[model samples]
Target: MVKQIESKTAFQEALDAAGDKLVVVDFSATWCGPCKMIKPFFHSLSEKYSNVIFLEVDVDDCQDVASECEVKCTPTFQFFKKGQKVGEFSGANKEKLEATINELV
Candidate 1:
């Protein structure tokens, strides 16, 4: 399911523990409008895909995590498997996001 990351360390731990599962990370910021728009969609997807691990990180709240991941903007989606990044996208494109997940699965 869905997990919210509060720090860089927590994010790293999640990445470490993911093991071969689809890990979806949403790197968003509080001031971003697009990020807010797609948040519910992300949550719904989290419910739809029980096998996938969904996570959210506010860029401002977790600056270190954002920096470590090199997230330059809001509404950035990162996909990982067994600790390696397989896919990533920016903005609020629901179609591309869903398509990315579908391909990964």
Candidate 2:
């Protein structure tokens, strides 16, 4: 299951816990249509990729984490490794999203 981040502290802890593992974060909002559409896909990916750490952040609930990550759009996907952002993109492209995860994982 994707860990739901409710605060900046939780976000940081998730990253820290991930260590050298690839951490994929979905920065989304409740009102975002694209986010809602891709959510199940993202969750499925989590189950498929057991070695990866999946995190979901509600933009409205954790504004600090979103701003810290400089998220400017809904459904923004950020990939982190070693607590550093290694890749980022925004959209609901299932193929591209899975491809990116595969590339990193």
Candidate 3:
């Protein structure tokens, strides 16, 4: 199931718990246009990759997470494996999104 994380501490714990599997951390804000644009696609991807841990961190509510991850944009996605960052993508391109997920998942 996709987890909704609201703090840096919980985000850290979730990343640690991800272990060897790929984890997709999506940093977004409700007011972001691009974020809203990509929300459905992200949800679809989450459903497609049920084995992957999909985490949503709201930038407004979880500023610490945004600061720690150095998120400069909404709908920014960071992929990590075994607690190490592997890949990332930003914006709302369907192909790029799928490709990134394909690469990690």
Candidate 4:
């Protein structure tokens, strides 16, 4: 299941719970057209990438946390592991996103 993080507290709790697992966070906003287009593909990715944990942070709802994470745009994908960020990519590029996860996994 894709974990939706709407607050800083929940986001931190999720990180603690995730431990050293690969975490994929989708930093998006409700008004973003690209974000809307990518959610479905992101869900499909969540289906196959079992080793990787999926998360979603709505920038509109979690602005402080989103700013803390340096999210300048919606549809931004950030990858983390062992509580540290390992990679990041933006835009609605499904193939690139899939390739990145495959490589990291």
Each prediction's TM-score against the native?
Answer: 0.88, 0.90, 0.85, 0.88
Tens digits of per-residue lDDT, candidate 1, 43-85, equal 7886788878888888877888889888766779999888888
Error of 1 at 98 (Å): 1.2
Best by TM-score: 2
Q: Tell me how candidate 1 scores on lDDT.
A: 0.82
> lDDT (CA) for every model shown?
0.82, 0.82, 0.78, 0.81
lDDT of 3 by residue, 1-105 (tens): 678897767887998887777788777886777676777777677677767788887888888878987877667888878878889777756568667777867
Residue 53, model 1: lDDT of 86
Give lDDT tens digits, candidate 4, residues 7-65.
87788889888877778888887677767677778877667777778998888878978
lDDT of 2 by residue, 1-105 (tens): 578888877777888888788898888886767677787788787678888888888887788889997877678889998888889998767678877977887
Model 2 per-residue lDDT at 52: 82
Clash totals, every prediction? 0, 0, 0, 0
Candidate 2 clashes: the total is: 0
Model 4, stretches more than 4 Å misplaced?
none
lDDT of 2 at 94: 62
**TM-score of model 2 (CA atoms):** 0.90
How good is model 1 by TM-score? Answer: 0.88
Question: Which stretches of candidate 3 lie above 4 Å from their native place?
Answer: 31-34
RMSD, candidate 3, Å: 1.8
**Candidate 3 structure, TM-score to reference:** 0.85
